[PDB]
Amino acid sequence: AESTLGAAAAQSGRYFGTAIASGKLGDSAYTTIASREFNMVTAENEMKIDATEPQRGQFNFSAGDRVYNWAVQNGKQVRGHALAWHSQQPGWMQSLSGSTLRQAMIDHINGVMGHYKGKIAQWDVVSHAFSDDGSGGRRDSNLQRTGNDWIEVAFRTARAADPAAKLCYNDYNIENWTWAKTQGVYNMVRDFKQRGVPIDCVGFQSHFNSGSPYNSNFRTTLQNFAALGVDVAITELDIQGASSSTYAAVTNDCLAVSRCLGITVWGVRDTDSWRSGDTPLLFNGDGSKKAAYTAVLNALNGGGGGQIKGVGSGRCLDVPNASTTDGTQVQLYDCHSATNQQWTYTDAGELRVYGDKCLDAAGTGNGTKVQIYSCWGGDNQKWRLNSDGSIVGVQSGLCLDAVGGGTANGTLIQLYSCSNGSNQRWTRT
Amino acid sequence: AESTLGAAAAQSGRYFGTAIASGKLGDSAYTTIASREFNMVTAENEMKIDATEPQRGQFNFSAGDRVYNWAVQNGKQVRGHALAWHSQQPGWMQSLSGSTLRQAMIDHINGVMGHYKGKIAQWDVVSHAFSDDGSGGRRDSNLQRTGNDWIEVAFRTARAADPAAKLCYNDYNIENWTWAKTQGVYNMVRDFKQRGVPIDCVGFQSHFNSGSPYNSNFRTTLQNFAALGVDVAITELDIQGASSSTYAAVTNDCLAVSRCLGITVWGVRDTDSWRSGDTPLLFNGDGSKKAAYTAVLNALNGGGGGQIKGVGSGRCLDVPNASTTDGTQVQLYDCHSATNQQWTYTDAGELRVYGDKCLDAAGTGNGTKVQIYSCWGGDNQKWRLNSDGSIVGVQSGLCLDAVGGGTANGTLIQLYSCSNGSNQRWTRT
Numbered sequence: 001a002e003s004t005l006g007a008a009a010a011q012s013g014r015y016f017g018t019a020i021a022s023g024k025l026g027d028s029a030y031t032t033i034a035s036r037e038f039n040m041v042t043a044e045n046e047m048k049i050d051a052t053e054p055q056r057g058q059f060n061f062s063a064g065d066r067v068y069n070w071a072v073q074n075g076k077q078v079r080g081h082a083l084a085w086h087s088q089q090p091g092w093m094q095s096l097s098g099s100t101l102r103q104a105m106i107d108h109i110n111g112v113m114g115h116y117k118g119k120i121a122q123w124d125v126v127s128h129a130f131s132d133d134g135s136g137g138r139r140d141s142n143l144q145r146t147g148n149d150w151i152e153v154a155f156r157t158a159r160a161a162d163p164a165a166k167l168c169y170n171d172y173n174i175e176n177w178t179w180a181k182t183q184g185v186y187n188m189v190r191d192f193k194q195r196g197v198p199i200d201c202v203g204f205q206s207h208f209n210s211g212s213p214y215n216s217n218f219r220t221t222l223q224n225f226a227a228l229g230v231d232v233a234i235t236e237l238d239i240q241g242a243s244s245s246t247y248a249a250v251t252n253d254c255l256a257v258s259r260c261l262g263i264t265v266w267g268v269r270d271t272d273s274w275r276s277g278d279t280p281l282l283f284n285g286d287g288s289k290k291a292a293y294t295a296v297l298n299a300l301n302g303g304g305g306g307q308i309k310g311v312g313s314g315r316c317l318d319v320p321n322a323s324t325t326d327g328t329q330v331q332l333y334d335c336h337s338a339t340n341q342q343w344t345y346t347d348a349g350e351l352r353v354y355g356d357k358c359l360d361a362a363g364t365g366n367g368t369k370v371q372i373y374s375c376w377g378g379d380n381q382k383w384r385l386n387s388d389g390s391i392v393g394v395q396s397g398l399c400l401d402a403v404g405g406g407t408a409n410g411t412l413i414q415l416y417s418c419s420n421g422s423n424q425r426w427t428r429t
Numbered sequence: 430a431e432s433t434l435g436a437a438a439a440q441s442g443r444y445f446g447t448a449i450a451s452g453k454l455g456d457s458a459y460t461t462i463a464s465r466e467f468n469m470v471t472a473e474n475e476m477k478i479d480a481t482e483p484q485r486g487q488f489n490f491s492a493g494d495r496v497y498n499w500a501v502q503n504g505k506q507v508r509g510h511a512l513a514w515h516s517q518q519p520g521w522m523q524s525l526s527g528s529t530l531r532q533a534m535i536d537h538i539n540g541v542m543g544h545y546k547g548k549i550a551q552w553d554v555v556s557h558a559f560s561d562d563g564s565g566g567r568r569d570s571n572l573q574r575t576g577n578d579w580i581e582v583a584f585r586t587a588r589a590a591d592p593a594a595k596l597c598y599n600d601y602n603i604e605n606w607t608w609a610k611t612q613g614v615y616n617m618v619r620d621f622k623q624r625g626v627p628i629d630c631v632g633f634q635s636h637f638n639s640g641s642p643y644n645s646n647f648r649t650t651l652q653n654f655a656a657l658g659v660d661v662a663i664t665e666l667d668i669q670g671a672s673s674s675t676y677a678a679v680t681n682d683c684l685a686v687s688r689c690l691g692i693t694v695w696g697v698r699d700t701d702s703w704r705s706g707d708t709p710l711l712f713n714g715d716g717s718k719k720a721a722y723t724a725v726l727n728a729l730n731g732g733g734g735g736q737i738k739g740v741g742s743g744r745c746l747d748v749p750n751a752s753t754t755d756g757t758q759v760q761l762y763d764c765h766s767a768t769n770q771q772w773t774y775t776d777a778g779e780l781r782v783y784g785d786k787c788l789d790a791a792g793t794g795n796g797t798k799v800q801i802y803s804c805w806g807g808d809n810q811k812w813r814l815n816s817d818g819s820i821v822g823v824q825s826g827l828c829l830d831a832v833g834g835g836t837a838n839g840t841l842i843q844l845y846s847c848s849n850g851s852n853q854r855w856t857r858t
């Protein structure tokens with residue numbers, strides 16, 4: 001349709017996936033969100049080395065199939081993660097080196113891909129191969145020590161194991177074009193195409209935080225890699241803070257590159273995140289959509305301080321007598337130029353007034369008063385501005401409502417079940 | 430003395446306490462904070478009715494004493510809580526009614542106060558006596574039905590039991606002077622004082638949140654009760670969101686009333702709170718001091734938009750070329766009127782620039798670069814403004830530092846072990 005991420009993404013020929021954790025599929029709230037919003041799936045850990053080959057030569061796909069089965073059963077495609085890398089290697093593989101490790105690497109690829117032959121759309125054949133020391137060179141691991149040619153071997157090996165799959169190179173901190181790591185990966189992919197090494201895509205994990213923040217030049221990076229003759233994909237997206245603007249900007253970068261297959265966010269709810277502390281996903285603990293979700297959905301569909309006029313009463317959201325007192329319920333009044341009517345929507349999804357006061361709801365049920373309270377980040381102060389013009393309380397899940405459909409000055413604002421009514425739509429100015 | 434809350438408050442003859450949970454006195458991380466920051470203690474539950482008299486006439490002081498001893502052995506006074514109220518009554522008292530209840534109430538008071546006779550500074554003789562129905566009348570409880578004079582009786586009983594302890598009436602939602610409930614309590618205490626009813630104080634639980642927000646008239650309330658000849662005390666303070674200003678405001682209201690004995694916060698760390706979802710205390714779960722902690726400390730020691738100038742350099746905190754790019758490290762620069770030099774300290778402990786950008790630290794160690802990043806509420810975007818001029822990151826516990834003690838334009842800002850150096854002191858005007 002256009003009401004869920006997967007569907008909106010499809011309007012541009014793209015997909016929108018998430019990372020599924022089999023241990024959570026038993027959680028109905030989890031599966032309800034995951035099944036409805038995404039049309040692409042990645043196993044968070046079930047298809048990795050230690051999970052698929054517990055002992056040398058002994059393969060094990062019970063965990064992986066558990067995820068795969070759920071995906072196909074729910075009309076989702078699957079991304080294979082990951083075939084050859086230094087992290088999460090089972091004990092036995094960690095003790096290997098030289099040609100012994102090299103062949104173990106090849107045997108692992110053959111075993112996993114053979115089992116999933118023709119069922120996986122994309123395979124992260126190699127991941128985390130470059131360093132972060134800022135040199136843009138190869139990562140120093142037991143795999144790289146077997147010879148610089150190990151990555152090329154894994155790809156030729158993967159192409160032979162399942163010709164139907166797209167073979168991707170996956171890595172993080174390669175989104176900023178100015179970072180050496182990014183360029184090092186570009187030169188390798190470039191080298192591969194020139195020599196005819198099988199490689200169909202580059203996956204940019206996209207784990208953004210204040211350590212390695214999103215930079216708008218990410219679009220040039222996608223363009224650049226796409227120009228090498230490969231498809232690009234945002235594979236493990238999550239943003240510390242979950243800024244609406246940052247999440248919206250990444251969505252647009254991909255929509256600007258025809259070779260960008262889609263976006264996968266690393267998880268469903270912040271509580272499921274490997275970095276829940278950074279609350280970097282689109283849904284939060286209770287399964288409610290975050291400000292960033294709306295921003296992402298809006299971007300997929302096409303897309304400072306100001307006033308919030310209610311298209312249906314003509315009056316603006318106003319703080320009674322321009323009070324600065326916490327607990328003051330807002331009202332509707334004749335739009336004019338005064339700070340008591342200037343609302344700023346933040347990347348956190350707050351409707352700030354006076355700079356540090358936040359549109360607040362002291363409850364969740366219908367009839368709950370909408371007031372101003374010191375900003376502290378509570379979901380009861382977070383909002384989602386829907387494209388239809390409604391403002392939904394992230395925590396309540398209710399729309400800002402003009403009491404008794406009133407339209408006269410002094411009409412209080414309240415929380416009520418959304419109705420698409422005129423007393424629930426607004427326009428920014 | 431003024432490096433800890435207890436000592437700072439002691440400067441003015443007051444105390445700063447907390448609520449101790451017997452179950453955590455074996456948690457060194459917990460006791461390390463508690464024993465250092467407070468000089469007044471209240472058993473969070475150990476001294477309540479159900480806890481001290483599990484069977485009528487059969488008293489159990491095992492847990493109360495554990496807390497009482499820990500307190501005295503650690504230089505803290507003790508507030509008994511609570512002797513006669515409707516909540517948390519053992520199952521056998523709830524069933525009681527009429528004169529048999531009145532008698533039980535009397536005996537409980539004598540039994541418990543007898544045990545602690547002479548050891549308790551303050552006793553919450555009666556608590557939660559008034560309703561929240563707007564009429565300013567007594568809440569309808571099995572105790573109130575035994576006769577409206579139960580409160581007076583409990584107090585006369587208490588006085589006789591321990592003439593040495595200060596007897597307080599305790600309640601919530603009686604901080605706002607305009608509320609009916611507050612007036613009801615006011616009249617009762619005023620009536621008691623005139624008739625000679627032995628009540629020495631009124632405790633204001635002070636549980637503030639968007640539901641029952643703090644209001645500056647709280648001081649007026651305190652001042653009015655004090656005028657009646659009874660001491661006042663903030664007994665169970667906690668503020669939803671832990672706003673710096675609100676916490677400092679409550680502290681100054683008590684400093685403003687000579688009869689205000691002191692302030693008690695209902696818990697040590699947010700994780701210990703009965704309402705952790707509201708992160709209403711002064712210490713985070715990891716034990717680090719929150720922005721509000723310093724706001725209170727500074728206040729105890731006597732005490733929108735602007736420049737932050739370095740003392741040692743004479744230059745201001747500046748964002749290179751007014752960039753709004755996340756990850757941009759800030760520097761020192763000749764002070765001038767421009768938005769890339771106007772920082773706003775919010776109640777959340779943030780230092781905002783451009784309205785929605787936050788002073789950000791991407792790590793917790795020395796040499797961590799200080800930059801701007803979209804505001805989202807992380808502890809690495811919260812700061813404490815020490816009274817010495819230094820600015821300490823909440824999460825890191827590190828000071829803003831002008832690299833290498835540089836004083837020239839272009840000197841970058843980093844995190845570093847606080848040293849009282851002039852490249853770590855700042856004056857904001």
Ligand SMILES: O[C@@H]1[C@@H](O)[C@H](O[C@@H]2CO[C@@H](O[C@@H]3CO[C@@H](O[C@@H]4CO[C@@H](O[C@@H]5CO[C@@H](O)[C@H](O)[C@H]5O)[C@H](O)[C@H]4O)[C@H](O)[C@H]3O)[C@H](O)[C@H]2O)OC[C@H]1O
Nearest residue numbers: 044045087127132133134172173205207209211212236274
């Ligand atoms: O359940 C868990 C799985 O979810 C988990 O999945 C893996 C998560 O993502 C990938 O692995 C991690 C990628 O991010 C790495 O951390 C980087 C390190 O660099 C930071 O930036 C640095 C800032 O300072 C500079 O000086 C420096 O040069 C920069 O590099 C960046 O901000 C961090 O995000 C982690 O170490 C990786 O583990 C991987 O694809 C997923 O499979 O796996 C574990 C499982 O338990």
Ligand SMILES: O[C@@H]1[C@@H](O)[C@H](O[C@@H]2CO[C@@H](O[C@@H]3CO[C@@H](O[C@@H]4CO[C@@H](O[C@@H]5CO[C@@H](O)[C@H](O)[C@H]5O)[C@H](O)[C@H]4O)[C@H](O)[C@H]3O)[C@H](O)[C@H]2O)OC[C@H]1O
Nearest residue numbers: 362473474510561601602634636637638639640641665703
């Ligand atoms: O370990 C736990 C102990 O910590 C715990 O200690 C007791 C906790 O409760 C304390 O008393 C509480 C005071 O606050 C009450 O809630 C008020 C109710 O009113 C709300 O505001 C209303 C909003 O709606 C409006 O219409 C209405 O007019 C407003 O009044 C306000 O926001 C809430 O905070 C609690 O119900 C009381 O329990 C007590 O003193 C402590 O000793 O005990 C349990 C133990 O396990």
Ligand SMILES: O[C@@H]1[C@@H](O)[C@H](O[C@@H]2CO[C@@H](O[C@@H]3CO[C@@H](O[C@@H]4CO[C@@H](O)[C@H](O)[C@H]4O)[C@H](O)[C@H]3O)[C@H](O)[C@H]2O)OC[C@H]1O
Nearest residue numbers: 795796830831832833834835843845846847848849850852
């Ligand atoms: O217990 C406290 C002590 O820890 C504290 O120690 C002081 C800490 O600051 C020291 O001065 C620092 C030294 O580093 C400078 O920055 C570095 C400059 O070179 C760069 O390459 C590097 O990246 C920067 O990190 C910093 O500007 C400067 O302030 C000081 O000498 C120590 O004594 O002292 C107080 C104790 O109570």
Ligand SMILES: O[C@@H]1[C@@H](O)[C@H](O[C@@H]2CO[C@@H](O[C@@H]3CO[C@@H](O)[C@H](O)[C@H]3O)[C@H](O)[C@H]2O)OC[C@H]1O
Nearest residue numbers: 318319320321322331333336338340341409410
């Ligand atoms: O008790 C309630 C009153 O406090 C409440 O007062 C309203 C305060 O706002 C008045 O309108 C202002 C006109 O000027 C604009 O600039 C302001 O933004 C408006 O808020 C309004 O007329 C007052 O009634 O009224 C309702 C009472 O129950």
Ligand SMILES: O[C@@H]1[C@@H](O)[C@H](O[C@@H]2CO[C@@H](O)[C@H](O)[C@H]2O)OC[C@H]1O
Nearest residue numbers: 367401402403404405416419421423
């Ligand atoms: O207290 C009353 C409210 O409960 C009432 O709420 C209305 C319910 O229907 C919705 O369609 C309206 O938008 C909403 O205002 O409003 C009147 C008020 O007195």
Ligand SMILES: O[C@@H]1[C@@H](O)[C@H](O[C@@H]2CO[C@@H](O)[C@H](O)[C@H]2O)OC[C@H]1O
Nearest residue numbers: 747748749750751760762767769839
């Ligand atoms: O030379 C450059 C500096 O100019 C820049 O900082 C700006 C200097 O001019 C001031 O008016 C601006 O406020 C300030 O941000 O920093 C980078 C340095 O290379």
